[PDB]
């Protein structure tokens, strides 16, 4: 089931899980990566999406896996702090016959994100800025939206 | 046998990773496909 199916945002938010049945939970494991204690990272960059899209939990997990592996192989295991801001709260339901009784079963969750809303926030040192930026570039290739990187902290620290 | 100028004009070029097109040894981008990564032609 490709991500083009559950991508466009034309339906309201289906998140109240006490009035639905049996949501298969997200495959996304963690939401904080790297040094979860050092708040003294001067250069901080964030990956933002520039469309209104619904990111599946599997897409978020794949993007997090590629970004975290690239950052661990670039800046060491404790030379970065990467934050996946958005939780997949929407429940995605598929009509698994014909169109009679078409309200489908829940087949997974997803996160509805607005334009310019940050997905990943990465805090790195001065020298590891390029590796973090390039890993965030690899992260957005696994997402269903055009993504552009924006610098949070230390804009003067880079150029 | 293997000759110096023969390997200069035969095995001293780069190859595109995608399209496998011959490109110059000093070129960092394929002329045909525009791919960014080129490898030297194998000689062993």
């Amino acid at each position: 089931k490709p991500g083009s199916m559950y991508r466009n945002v034309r339906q309201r938010s289906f998140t109240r899980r006490k009035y639905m049945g049996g949501v298969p939970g997200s495959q996304v494991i963690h939401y904080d990566m790297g040094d979860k204690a050092n708040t003294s990272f001067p250069v901080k960059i964030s990956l933002i999406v520039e469309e209104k899209c619904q990111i599946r939990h599997t897409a978020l997990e794949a993007a997090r896996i590629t970004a975290n592996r690239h950052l661990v192989a670039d800046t060491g295991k404790m030379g970065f702090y990467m934050k996946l801001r958005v939780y997949p709260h929407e429940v995605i339901r598929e009509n698994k016959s014909g169109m009679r009784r078409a309200f489908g079963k829940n087949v997974g969750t997803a996160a509805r994100v607005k334009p310019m809303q940050k997905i990943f926030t990465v805090a790195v040192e001065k020298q590891n800025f390029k590796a973090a930026k390039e890993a965030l570039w690899h992260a957005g290739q696994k997402l269903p939206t055009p993504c552009r990187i924006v610098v949070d902290e230390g804009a003067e620290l880079v150029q | 046998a293997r000759f110096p100028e023969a390997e200069e004009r035969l095995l001293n070029k780069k190859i595109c990773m995608k399209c496998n097109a011959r490109n110059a040894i000093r070129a960092t981008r394929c002329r045909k496909c525009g791919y960014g990564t080129l490898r030297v032609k194998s000689k062993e």
């Binding site: - | 000759f3 023969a6 390997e7 200069e8 004009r9 035969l10 095995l11 194998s42 000689k43």
Partner: protein, 176 residues
């Protein structure tokens, strides 16, 4: 600082060059060469042993065109003043090629045992001498000498074998 897109070619002594119509001709001791060099918006002027090529607009295509035209003009003046000489090597593994010049085409006999000789054209008023193990090419036109060397090296291209084992042919050791 301030760019100058215009370029200047000093015409050396003994070489008389004109720009009658859009064709550029350089006449000198080594020979004479006529060439067509017309691009829109690029003005070429010959005067007093020096030619300047300049473009009205300064966009990147105009800069590339003025550079290419200046290089062509200087190659023409060097060919008609001193000329060009190119070098190639004749190296074989097992079958000794018989290389000879029988007109305006070169002869490559017994190339890897082939009973039909390969024929390589000679471009322009180009002199090709097969002096034993190596070939020497001379001419007043750099494009003609380069294309003659290219024709000789291209017609010796083995077309199915590994080049890491089969390396026979004629190869350039020095360009124009």
């Amino acid at each position: 600082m301030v760019k100058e897109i215009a370029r200047t070619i000093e015409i050396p002594e003994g070489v008389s060059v004109s720009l009658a119509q859009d064709v550029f001709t350089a006449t000198g001791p080594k020979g004479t060469v006529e060439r067509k060099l017309w691009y829109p918006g690029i003005m070429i002027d010959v005067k007093d042993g020096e030619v300047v090529v300049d473009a009205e607009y300064a966009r990147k295509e105009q800069k590339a065109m003025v550079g290419t035209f200046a290089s062509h003009i200087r190659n023409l003046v060097k060919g008609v003043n001193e000329g060009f000489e190119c070098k190639m090597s004749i190296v074989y593994a097992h079958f000794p090629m018989q290389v000879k010049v029988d007109g305006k085409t070169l002869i490559i006999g017994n190339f890897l045992g082939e009973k039909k000789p390969r024929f390589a054209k000679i471009i322009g008023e180009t002199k090709v001498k097969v002096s034993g193990n190596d070939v020497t090419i001379t001419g007043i036109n750099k494009e003609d000498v380069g294309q003659t060397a290219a024709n000789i090296e291209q017609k010796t291209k083995i077309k199915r074998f590994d080049p890491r084992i089969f390396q026979d042919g004629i190869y350039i050791v020095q360009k124009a």
